[PDB]
Design a protein around this ligand. Sequence first.
Ligand SMILES: CC[C@H](NC(=O)c1cc[nH]n1)C(=O)O
Ligand SMILES: CC[C@H](NC(=O)c1cc[nH]n1)C(=O)O
Lengths: 410, 410
Amino acid sequence: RRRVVITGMGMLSPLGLDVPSSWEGILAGRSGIAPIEHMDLSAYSTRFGGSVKGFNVEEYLSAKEARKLDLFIQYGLAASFQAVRDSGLEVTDANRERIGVSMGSGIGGLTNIENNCRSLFEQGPRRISPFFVPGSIINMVSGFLSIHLGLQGPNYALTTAATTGTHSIGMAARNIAYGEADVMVAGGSEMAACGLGLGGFGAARALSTRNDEPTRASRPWDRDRDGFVLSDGSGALVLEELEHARARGARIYAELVGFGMSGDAFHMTAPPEDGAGAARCMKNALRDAGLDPRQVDYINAHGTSTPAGDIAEIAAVKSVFGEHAHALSMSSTKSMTGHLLGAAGAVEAIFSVLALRDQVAPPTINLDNPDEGCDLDLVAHEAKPRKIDVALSNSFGFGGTNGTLVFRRF
Amino acid sequence: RRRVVITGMGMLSPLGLDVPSSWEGILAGRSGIAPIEHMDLSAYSTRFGGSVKGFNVEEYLSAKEARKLDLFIQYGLAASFQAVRDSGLEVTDANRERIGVSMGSGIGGLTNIENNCRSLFEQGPRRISPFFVPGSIINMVSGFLSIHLGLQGPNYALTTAATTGTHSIGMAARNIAYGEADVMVAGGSEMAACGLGLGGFGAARALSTRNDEPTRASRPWDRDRDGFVLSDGSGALVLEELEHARARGARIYAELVGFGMSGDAFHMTAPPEDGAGAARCMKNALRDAGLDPRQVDYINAHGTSTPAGDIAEIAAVKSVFGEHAHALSMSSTKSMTGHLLGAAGAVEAIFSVLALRDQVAPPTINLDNPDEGCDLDLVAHEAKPRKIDVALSNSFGFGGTNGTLVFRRF
Ligand SMILES: CC[C@H](NC(=O)c1cc[nH]n1)C(=O)O
Ligand SMILES: CC[C@H](NC(=O)c1cc[nH]n1)C(=O)O
C-alpha cells in the first residue's frame, strides 16, 4: 500500500528535555537515575528513579491551561509539540482532516487521582476538581494536542503498559498505510512516580531496591539485576506518507517498514522462559516488513532489568535470528533511562531511528557480569559505531502483550 | 481485502446479565436506572445510575482470581467469555496465534485505585496490594482473557472515553482485514460508580441530578435533559474473517463493513454546535463501507442526554443524510441503559447488530418534548419494527474523539 516515514521527533526523558540532549546522554553512557526529590520516600523500599529534571510547562502551555492537566498529559503535549515543530509541517484547511494523534499512557493521571482522592476522603466529594476527569483520562494528550493544533484526523489512545508507545506508533503507521491519515503524531507519556506508583510496583516486588547506587540499579542481563527502575517522560514521532513527505521536501529520518504483535497467553507479570511470544512478535514484524532475520543489524531491547524478562528476551532473539543472533547488536537503553512504561516504546523508537541516522548502537551500561546464556553482542558499557540498515524496537508488557517496530534507513 | 462478520456477542448491562435479557429490556422500553445501593451517596448531587444487578463473578472466575481484579476487569471478562461461548469457536494450536483481544475501558480501575489510596493515606505504602497494578490497568481485560483462553494474537486496549468500545471494535476489524488476525474479541467495560467517578462527573456538572425520578433522568433530545446518567457494564463481540467463519459453519449475526474516525479539534467536553466532526466521522465510515448515506436505515446515536451534545448530533445527521435524514430511524438506547462510557460503544454495537437481526429500531424512551430542530424519527417511546439493511453506531468522546461503525445484514 503506502509507505510511512518519520519526519519529526520529540522527547522528555531522564537524560534531557529534548531529543538531541537525551541522545547525547545515551551515546555517552550517562545514567538518568537519581534519588527522587519531589516527594519524601524515606518509608519506601525504592527511593530513586528517572525524573524529568527542570521541566518548564510554560514553554508549551499557559499556567491556567497547565494547572488543569496531570503531568503525564503535560509531558505528552511537550514531546508532541517538539515533534510537530521538528517535522516542519504546516497544518492548513487543505490537510487538517488528514492529520491525527495516537498518544498513549500506561497508568495515566495517577498523581491527579491520588491528590483528588486525598480531598475526597478528608473533605468529601465537593472538593474534587471540576477538571479531574478531562485532566486525568489517558486520551486527553490526543484530545488537547488535536485542539491546540487543529488536528481533525483519527484521534485515539492505547494503554498497554510497556507496549503502549510501540502499539501507538504501529497502529498510527497502519492508519497512514490504510489511507485513514497522511500524518499521525504518535507515542506515549508517563508520570507514575507518586505514592501509588512506587508503592504499587514495590508491593509487586517489581522494582530494583539498590538505593545505595541508583545509577547501577538498571543492569539488563547482569547477574545481579533485581527489577526495573521507574522513570517518567514522553516520546512523540511525526509519521507521514512518503509521497506526502517528499512533496513538501520534508527531512526524512528513516522509514517505518514493519509492525508486529503477539500475546504470550502465559502469565500477567512473567514471560515464558523461552520468550516464545516475543519470538512470534519479532517474526510478525519482520514478515510485515518483508525482511529476513539476517537483514537486522540493531535491536533496541525491552531489557527492563528483571530476572525472568531479560533472559526470556535472549532466548527469543536466539530462536528468531539463529546464527545471525551473534552478528547483530542488541542493547537496552533502559540501562541509562530506566523504564518509562507507557513512554518506553516511544523514546526507544526515537533511539532506534537515531541509531540509523548516526550509525551507532547505544550501549547497555552496568553490564558487568552477563548472566548465563547472555553471550550476544549486548553493546556492554560503550556505544559501538557500526553499519545499521535495519533496527528493531521490542516492547513486552504486563499481560504478555508484545509489540515490535522495524525501522530502516530510507 | 478480507470481509469481517460478527459470530458472537456478550454483555453485562443495567438491563441484564447477558445479551438476550438486555435486548428484551431494550425492545420493551425498560429503564435500567435506579438509586445506587452499593455506596452511600446522601452527600452527592447525583445518587442514581445504571448498575449491573446480581453479577456473580464465580460464574466466570474462581474467588481467589476474582479478588485480585477490579470490577471493570470482571465485567470485561464476563462479556468476553459470553461472546466466545456464543461464537462456538474452538481454540486449537492450529488457530490460537490468529485470535486476538481488544477490550478497552474509559476510566479503568477507579474503585481499586480509590481503595488502595485509602490504605496508602491511613497506613502508608506497605498496605498497597501486590496485585494493585496488574488488577487495575486497563489492558488486563485483554491480558487475563488471552491467558484464560490461550489467545496469542494481537493483544491491546483502547481508552477513548465514550468512543472506547467503538475504536476497540473498529481497530479489531482492521487487524482481521489486514491479515494480522482471523478472529478478535473486541469491546469495552466500565465500572466508574465510586466516589471519584460520581464526584468527578458531578464536579464537572456533567450528570443529570433528577434524583426524584431516576428512570426519567436520561432523556436524549428532550428539552428538559440535564446531563448524562453514569452506568456500568461491558460488551464484547467475536469479529471473524468471512471465509474462516463459513469454513466452520459459524452462525453469522451481521457484517461489519465500515469504520470511521475524526477529531473535533474544538473543546474537551463540548462539541461544535453544528457537529462538524461527527459529520466527517459518519462520512468516513460510509466511505470505508462503500455506502451512500441513502442506504442507511438505522442510527444507534451517541445521544447521552446533554444540552450541547444531543442537538450537535441532530445537526451532523441532517448535514450527512440531507432529505434521507427524515427517512432513516435514529434512537439513543442510553434513554434506557444510561451512559456506560468505555462500554457504551460495545453494547451499542450489539444493539445495532440485533436491530439488523430482529428488523426493529429500539426506542428513545423519555422523549416527551423534542427540543428545537429535533424533528427526525427518533423512535420516541416505543420500538419501531421496520426494514433495516444498514445500521450505524456513533460514539463522540471527551477530547472531541469520534468513531462510527457501519453494520450490514449479511
Ligand atoms: C510479561 C511482561 C514482560 N515480558 C517480558 O519481559 C518478556 C521477555 C520475553 N518475552 N516477554 C515481563 O516479563 O515483565
Ligand atoms: C466532545 C464530546 C461529546 N461530543 C458530542 O456529544 C458530539 C455531538 C456531536 N458531535 N460531538 C460531548 O459533547 O459530550
